[PDB]
Amino acid sequence: RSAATREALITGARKLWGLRGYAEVGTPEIATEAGVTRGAMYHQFADKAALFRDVVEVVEQDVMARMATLVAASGAATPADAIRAAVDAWLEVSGDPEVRQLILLDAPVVLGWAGFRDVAQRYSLGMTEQLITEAIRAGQLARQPVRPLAQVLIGALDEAAMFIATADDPKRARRETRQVLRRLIDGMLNG
Amino acid sequence: RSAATREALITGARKLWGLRGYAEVGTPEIATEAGVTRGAMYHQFADKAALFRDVVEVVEQDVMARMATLVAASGAATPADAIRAAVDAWLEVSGDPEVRQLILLDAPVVLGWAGFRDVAQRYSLGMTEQLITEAIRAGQLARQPVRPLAQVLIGALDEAAMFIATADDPKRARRETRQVLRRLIDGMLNG
Ligand SMILES: O=C(CCC(F)(F)F)N1CCC2(CC1)CC(c1ccccc1)=NO2
Ligand SMILES: O=C(CCC(F)(F)F)N1CCC2(CC1)CC(c1ccccc1)=NO2
Numbered sequence: 001r002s003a004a005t006r007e008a009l010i011t012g013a014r015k016l017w018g019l020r021g022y023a024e025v026g027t028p029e030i031a032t033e034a035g036v037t038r039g040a041m042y043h044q045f046a047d048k049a050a051l052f053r054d055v056v057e058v059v060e061q062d063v064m065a066r067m068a069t070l071v072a073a074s075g076a077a078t079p080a081d082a083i084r085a086a087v088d089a090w091l092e093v094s095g096d097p098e099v100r101q102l103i104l105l106d107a108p109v110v111l112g113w114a115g116f117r118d119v120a121q122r123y124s125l126g127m128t129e130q131l132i133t134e135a136i137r138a139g140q141l142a143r144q145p146v147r148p149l150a151q152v153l154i155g156a157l158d159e160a161a162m163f164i165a166t167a168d169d170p171k172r173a174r175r176e177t178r179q180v181l182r183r184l185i186d187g188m189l190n191g
Numbered sequence: 192r193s194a195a196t197r198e199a200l201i202t203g204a205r206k207l208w209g210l211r212g213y214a215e216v217g218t219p220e221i222a223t224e225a226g227v228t229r230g231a232m233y234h235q236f237a238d239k240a241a242l243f244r245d246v247v248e249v250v251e252q253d254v255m256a257r258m259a260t261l262v263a264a265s266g267a268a269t270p271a272d273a274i275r276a277a278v279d280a281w282l283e284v285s286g287d288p289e290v291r292q293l294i295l296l297d298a299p300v301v302l303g304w305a306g307f308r309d310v311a312q313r314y315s316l317g318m319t320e321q322l323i324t325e326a327i328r329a330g331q332l333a334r335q336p337v338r339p340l341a342q343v344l345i346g347a348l349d350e351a352a353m354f355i356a357t358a359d360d361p362k363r364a365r366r367e368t369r370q371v372l373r374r375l376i377d378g379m380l381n382g
Contacts, residue, residue: 108304109303109304109305112299112300112303112304113299113300113304113307113353114299114300116304117350117353142374144367144370144371144374145367147367148354148364148367148368148370148371149371151350151351151354151368152347152350152351152354152368152371152372152375153347154350155346155347155349155350155351155353155354156343156344156346156347156350158346158350159342159343159345159346159347159349159350160339160342160343160346162346163339163342163343173339176335176336176339177339177343179335179339180335180339180340180343181343183333183335183379184343184375184378184379186378187375187377187378187379188374188375188378
């Protein structure tokens, strides 16, 4: 009931901000797109940023599900290959124009640096730790504490995507950044 | 005269916000600390955040000077060694409680994402590109476009420092993150 109003607001905001950016669409337009009144919207979300926070949750969940799907489909036969495929999967999902606009461009502004990292952490860490733990167990990555490596890799990957997202030639940035990420990955991976 | 008032406000704000955080010290207390009136302060800085921006400039300049000093003192004889020493120097300068409070914690909040990145870029990028260009010229790092590598390393290094700054056991986080960065560096450096 209130749940339905929330879902419709989230879906509408996600679509519209996905196309034009956070800064460019006001809450009244989103309400109308969702078919709810300003009163019903304000009951669910005190302000714009509160709606954005729930939009980021749904988008990041879908980012993580899409990553798992691409890693499972990549045909990686070793943990090392799976790490390589995960890097490609992120460059692929981060290039989706909605993910680019909402996560790479709008979320660092609206949530701050700490808020963005918090979101990135909660969604990304588990899978990152997992892939690391598996390469280690297979002897393909030197034995280490998992959390610090995970954190650095996440920071490097999030920054890679941002650099592609704002570059004048996205196509060249993506290719050159992929090479960079490859070398950095291949420098810690054994074989 | 008013120049002196500017310097004393910057020095006082830097010290006090360094110790207690931006949010915890008001402009009246900083005026008093510097021995100047509210009207002299307001003549130099329209508001609190304007003062903070100048504080960030002097602190980031000192971050960069202290990094150059640590790299020059390491006795690095090759570009590779200089990259190794620069990584250590950043973890060391990052861990200064004033740098931690003003740059890592307060600046993202007060400046906003775009403003903070802009500042971090202007102070970091030049030196990062330089050390990369030198390792390449020496044959110690594979020939590649400089900007993408620079940006990924910056993202990894900024995230390393953030993780140390907010970790439960900062001392263990620093040591383990340093090891991680060393492996990652040693994997790409030919020498
Ligand atoms: O969802 C995010 C970031 C979301 C954001 F909100 F911060 F933007 N990802 C980046 C990190 C991951 C997941 C996707 C993990 C990963 C990986 C690759 C190789 C070895 C270990 C982990 N690649 O991408
Ligand atoms: O000032 C900042 C960051 C400011 C922040 F606002 F983002 F926090 N620095 C981080 C990156 C640098 C310089 C200092 C670059 C560097 C290095 C080391 C090895 C090879 C290449 C570059 N070490 O630290």
